[PDB]
A paper describes a structure:
Most importantly, the T6SS from the Gram-negative, pathogenic bacterium Pseudomonas aeruginosa was shown to inject at least three different effector molecules (named Tse1, Tse2, and Tse3; Type-6-Secretion-Exported) into the periplasmic space of competing cells. Tse1 was shown to be an amidase that cleaves the γ-D-glutamyl-l-meso-diaminopimelic acid amide bond of crosslinked PG, and Tse3 is a muramidase that cleaves the PG-backbone between the N-acetylmuramic acid and the N-acetylglucosamine moieties. As injection of effector proteins by the T6SS would also cause cell death of siblings, P. aeruginosa co-synthesizes the cognate immunity proteins Tsi1 and Tsi3 (Type-6-Secretion-Immunity) and shuttles them into their periplasmic space to confer resistance. Tse1 adopts the fold of N1pC/P60 papain-like cysteine peptidases, which are widespread among bacteria and of which homologues were identified in eukaryotes, phages, viruses, and archaea.
Tsi1 is formed by three twisted antiparallel β-sheets resembling a fragmented β-propeller followed by a short C-terminal α-helix. In particular, the N-terminal strand 1 crosses over these first two sheets in a β-addition module and a disulfide bond between Cys79 and Cys121 (DSB 1) forms a rigid covalent link between them. Tsi1 and Tse1 form a complex via a contact surface (on average 1049 Å2 for all four molecules per asymmetric unit) which occludes the active site of Tse1. More importantly, the loop region between β-strands 9 and 10 of Tsi1 directly interacts with residues of the active site of Tse1. Apart from steric hindrance of substrate binding by Tsi1, the hydroxyl function of Tsi1 Ser109 forms a hydrogen bond with the Nδ of the catalytic Tse1 His91. In doing so, it replaces the catalytically important water molecule (W1) and prevents deprotonation of Cys30. When comparing the molecular surface of Tse1 and Tsi1 and its conservation, we found a perfect complementary of the two molecular surfaces and this conserved loop region between β-strands 9 and 10 forms a knob on the molecular surface of Tsi1 which is inserted into the active site. Finally, this disulfide bond was observed in the crystal structure of Tse1 in complex with Tsi1 as well.
Author numbering:
A (entry chain B): 23 to 169
B (entry chain A): 3 to 149
Amino acid sequence: AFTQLEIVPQFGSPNMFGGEDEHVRVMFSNEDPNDDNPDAFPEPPVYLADRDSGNDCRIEDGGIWSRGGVFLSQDGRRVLMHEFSGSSAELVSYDSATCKVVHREDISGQRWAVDKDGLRLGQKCSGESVDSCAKIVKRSLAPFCQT
Amino acid sequence: SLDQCIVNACKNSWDKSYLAGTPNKDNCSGFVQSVAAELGVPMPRGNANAMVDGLEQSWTKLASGAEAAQKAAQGFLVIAGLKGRTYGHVAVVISGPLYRQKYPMCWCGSIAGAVGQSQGLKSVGQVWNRTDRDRLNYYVYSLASCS
């Protein structure tokens, strides 16, 4: 079960955007020279701190990370991430301890929303929100959670 | 500047809707169709994937995105484009500072979300991901637009 993580500036580390809960801290760096308040992170790495063991890893390669497309699992074992390229999109789930990819799924052309309930995927929309879609499909986040 | 006729064509084609229902800003192929129709520049038909196929046949292609900015600053319509597995992407290239000293500024709508969109504030390297951005093809129209 994933809960949304807000990604905000980290005072003390110039150009660092991140957030955390009891279990996991996620961090990007902003290499965009023009915007001091980005919405996306094209350039890796992504830093994941496993706050239980106190170790860290790095996601070294990856599609453009959506700020506020970041979700942490209840057990703290998984991190869910929205990653796009051009007009493609996908939801990737990573192992918070090893940074390994655990599940990938194409989401291209769909509008989307996740919460504790699951994943909602809509076609034929008329706005940014998935509730604007004439077709809405529920998909299980269990293969992302692996609990 | 000289490339103004194109930036104007972009700014106006943004809130338009080439495809009856879906707004241009949520459809990269629809936005390019609106810009080119304003400028009177013949465009291949179909989705982004079909358009790129179409450009590769008739339109001459440039060696680099740096060279794309050169043609763009000269008032030439320049389309950056990469074929997808199902959803390809296409963008208008405009003059201005190159991101990472390599990738040209752009205007494009995107079904991915606001993240994938650019109103001249993101380069093709901030729209396409790390892997993709180096596989882009840059196509230019034979004749000038603002001469």
